[PDB]
Amino acid sequence: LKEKAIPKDQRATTPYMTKYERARILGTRALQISMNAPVFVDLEGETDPLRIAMKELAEKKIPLVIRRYLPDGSFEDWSVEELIVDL
Amino acid sequence: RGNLMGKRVDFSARTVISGDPNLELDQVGVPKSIAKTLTYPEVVTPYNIDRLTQLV
Amino acid sequence: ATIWGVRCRPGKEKELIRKLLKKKFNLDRAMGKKKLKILSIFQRDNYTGRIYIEAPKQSVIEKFCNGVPDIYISQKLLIPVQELPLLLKPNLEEVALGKTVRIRSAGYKGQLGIVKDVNGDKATVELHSKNKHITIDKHKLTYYNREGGEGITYDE
Amino acid sequence: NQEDSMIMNQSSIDRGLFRSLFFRSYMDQEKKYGMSITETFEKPQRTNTLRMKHGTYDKLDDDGLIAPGVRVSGEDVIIGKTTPISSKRDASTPLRSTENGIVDQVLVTTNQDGLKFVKVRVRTTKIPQIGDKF
Amino acid sequence: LKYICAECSSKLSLSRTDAVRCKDCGHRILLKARTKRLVQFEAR
Amino acid sequence: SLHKMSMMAHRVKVIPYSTFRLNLSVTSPYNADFDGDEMNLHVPQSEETRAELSQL
RNA sequence: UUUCUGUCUCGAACCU
Ligand SMILES: [Mg+2]
Ligand SMILES: [Zn+2]
Incomplete structure (x- = not known):
């Protein structure tokens, strides 16, 4: 059932990124780059996948999305490009 | 309580602690022996192939 | 009838019955007219660890079973009158490995050691001085026989 | 500080x-597993089918002890025992992995029952x- | 010089399949002395 | 582990000796005293695990 | 050209 899903509008969760989302995304990109995924950024000799991940997050070039689970099972669907990673 | 809430695990060490003002706040000194035993599984990429081949 | 069942030690039941009767017969031989009132005693193999005794009053069985081991006189119970026909019914039941060596181009030179393992081009030796294992190239070590004396280079 | x-x-x-000096002693006994069956303190060998350990065994001499004067470490075997199995298998006690040093002394005797009993003492300097x- | 006694302080040079008693005295502790191999230490 | 900050991620510095060395100012949240105290080092085994420990 | 041993269970003493 899709009715629980919220559309791109009427989302009430914070666009400002949470530290836990930041940590999970850096880790997930870190697995992807460590296991031969394509790298979305020009590499200036960087070799640590975590550093490559931080660089991509800095440029908002991470192809990842978050279902932001409302506790009733519904979710808000938030893209990393639009998620304001201020901190 | 003894095997699920808290349990055992590898990839770990225990030893004495000494003060060290010549170490950064978020840094911790590890004995050479403890480093020799403990390992991190690192996957082979083009970006660390040379260093990993040297380590092997 | 008056029939009481007493707990006892499993597996020795016949020995208990035989001893009980020999005591009874000796008591009769010593005693005159007034005998103990024990109508009969028996056991049951498959209901092991238990004896059955008939007698009018409990004091008779106490004064019989004093001094009898392996019987729990404290543990006795009534057999119901309805239960007796069913209880009494008939139908029931590398040459360099492990050699003394001397190191020659290192800080540990002139030191005895024992070769423990060789990973190829590099021999690990436990130092025969220090409580430490060290890796050093095996070509640059002079090996010694089981006893000291002549020092042979790597040509064996 | x-x-x-x-x-x-x-x-x-x-x-x-x-x-300081650290002395640590180990024991072994020629326990009677099977009537007319006894272990013999001797050097185990790979030739017969035993479950020997990966530690070194050259430290032992033919007698079954480590020829005192020799030293040990890690998983070097201190007493060489073989238990018959019904060819035989190893039951030698290895040295402690975390401790090492030079064998100061070794004792061989008979216990109450006559089974041979061996007590090996190992010395270390600890600075x-x-x-x-x- | 395979073994020495504890009190007799005497060699025995015994072999396998022999009793572990001192021949000179009743005692059967039966130590044994250093190996014939060279042993080396430093002063550190 | 009486409280939250008693378990913190540190950067390894391989250091030749037999004792964990730790910066002195981190003794307060650990309630450590170097008086024979012992402490516990857990090595992560994955890029998720390292990322969590470094960022969180 | 023949390798992944291995334990429990009742306590005692000591360290932080
Ligand atoms: Mg303390
Ligand atoms: Zn003697």
């Missing part, structure tokens, strides 16, 4: 301050280090 640690003089340490407590 902080939090009630201490700064100890290295020159004093290695000129004699607070060094103050940072982690050592005072």
Whole structure:
């Protein structure tokens, strides 16, 4: 059932990124780059996948999305490009 | 309580602690022996192939 | 009838019955007219660890079973009158490995050691001085026989 | 020296301050597993089918002890015992992995029952280090 | 010089399949002395 | 582990000796005293695990 | 050209 899903509008969760989302995304990109995924950024000799991940997050070039689970099972669907990673 | 809430695990060490003002706040000194035993599984990429081949 | 069942030690039941009767017969031989009132005693193999005794009053069985081991006189119970026909019914039941060596181009030179393992081009030796294992190239070590004396280079 | 640690003089340490000897003893017995069946203290060999350990065995001599004077470490075997199995298998006690040193002494005797009983004592120097407590 | 006694302080040079008693005295502790191999230490 | 900050991620510095060395100012949240105290080092085995420990 | 041993269970003493 899709009715629980919220559309791109009427989302009430914070666009400002949470530290836990930041940590999970850096880790997930870190697995992807460590296991031969394509790298979305020009590499200036960087070799640590975590550093490559931080660089991509800095440029908002991470192809990842978050279902932001409302506790009733519904979710808000938030893209990393639009998620304001201020901190 | 003894095997699920808290349990055992590898990839770990225990030893004495000494003060060290010549170490950064978020840094911790590890004995050479403890480093020799403990390992991190690192996957082979083009970006660390040379260093990993040297380590092997 | 008056029939009481007493707990006892499993597996020795016949020995208990035989001893009980020999005591009874000796008591009769010593005693005159007034005998103990024990109508009969028996056991049951498959209901092991238990004896059955008939007698009018409990004091008779106490004064019989004093001094009898392996019987729990404290543990006795009534057999119901309805239960007796069913209880009494008939139908029931590398040459360099492990050699003394001397190191020659290192800080540990002139030191005895024992070769423990060789990973190829590099021999690990436990130092025969220090409580430490060290890796050093095996070509640059002079090996010694089981006893000291002549020092042979790597040509064996 | 902080939090009630201490700064100890290295020159004093290695000129004699607070060094010590560590003696550790191990035991073995020729326990009678099977009537007319006894272990024999001897050197185990790979030729017969035994479950010997990966530690070194050259330290042993033919007698079944480690020829005192020799030293040991890690998983070197201190007493060489073979239990018959019904060819035989190893039951030798290895040295402690974390401790090592030179064998000071070895004892061979008969116990009450006449089974041979062996007591091997191993010596080490133990010098103050940072982690050592005072 | 395979073994020495504990009180007699005497060699025995015994072999396998022999009793572990001192021949000179009743005692059977039966130590044994250093190996014939060279042993080396430093002063450190 | 009486409280939250008693378990913190540190950067390894391989250091030749037999004792963990730790910066002195981190003794307060650990309630450590170097008086024979012992401490516990857990090595992560994955890029998720390292990322969590470094960022969180 | 023949390798992944291995334990429990009742306590005692000591360290932080
Ligand atoms: Mg303390
Ligand atoms: Zn003697």
